[PDB]
C-alpha cells in the first residue's frame, strides 16, 4: 500500500528532480524496469587529476529507502585513497551519516567533492593515502595516468 510503496515513490521523485534539473556533468537513472537498481556517470572534475575521464557507478537502493543509504560502487577503475579495487567508496553519508533528507543528487555531489578533496585519514587504499599525504604532486601524476589508462 502507500506505506509499502514509499521507497518506490521516493525514487521516482528523485529521478524526476534529477532529470528536470540535470546535475552538472553527472547522470543517473534506472538500468531497466527495476527502479531500485541504477547506473550513474560522473565526469572527472575540471582541473582535477581525473579531468577528461568518465566514471561509471552502480547504485542499489534498499527496500526501506530513504531510511537507509543506497549502496554505491564505481565500476570504472580510479586512483583515489577512498575508493578500492572493488569500487567501494569510503564516504560518511553512505554509512553513518546517511539521513532520509539525502538524495541521489546529493550523493553524486558528495562523490564529486570527494574526488576533488580526498580524505587520506580514512583510506580504503593505504598506499594511495600515503602518497596523497606525502607527495601530492606525485599523487596527481599517478591519478592522471590511471585516468588516461582506464577512464578514457
From Swiss-Prot:
Belongs to the ubiquitin-conjugating enzyme family. Pfam families: UQ_con. It comes from Homo sapiens (Human). Keywords: ATP-binding, Nucleotide-binding, Transferase, Ubl conjugation pathway. Changing residue 95 to A: Abolishes histone H3 ubiquitination and decreases interaction with PHF7. Residues 6-152 form the UBC core domain. Changing residue 68 to A/E: Strongly reduced interaction with CNTO4. Interacts with SCF (SKP1-CUL1-F-box protein) E3 ubiquitin ligase complex. Interacts with CNOT4 (via RING domain). Interacts with E3 ubiquitin-protein ligases CBLC, PJA1 and PJA2. Interacts with PDZRN3. Interacts with PPP1R11. Interacts with E3 ubiquitin-protein ligase PHF7; the interaction inhibits cleavage of PHF7 and promotes association of the complex with the nucleosome core particle. GO terms for molecular function: ATP binding; ubiquitin conjugating enzyme activity; ubiquitin protein ligase activity; ubiquitin-protein transferase activity. Changing residue 98 to A: Abolishes histone H3 ubiquitination and decreases interaction with PHF7. Transmembrane segments: none annotated. Changing residue 90 to A: Catalytically inactive. Loss of ability to promote FBXW2-mediated GCM1 ubiquitination. Inhibition of TNF-alpha-induced degradation of NFKBIA. The gene is UBE2D2. This is Ubiquitin-conjugating enzyme E2 D2. The keyword NAD does not apply. The active site is at residue 90. Pathway: Protein modification; protein ubiquitination.
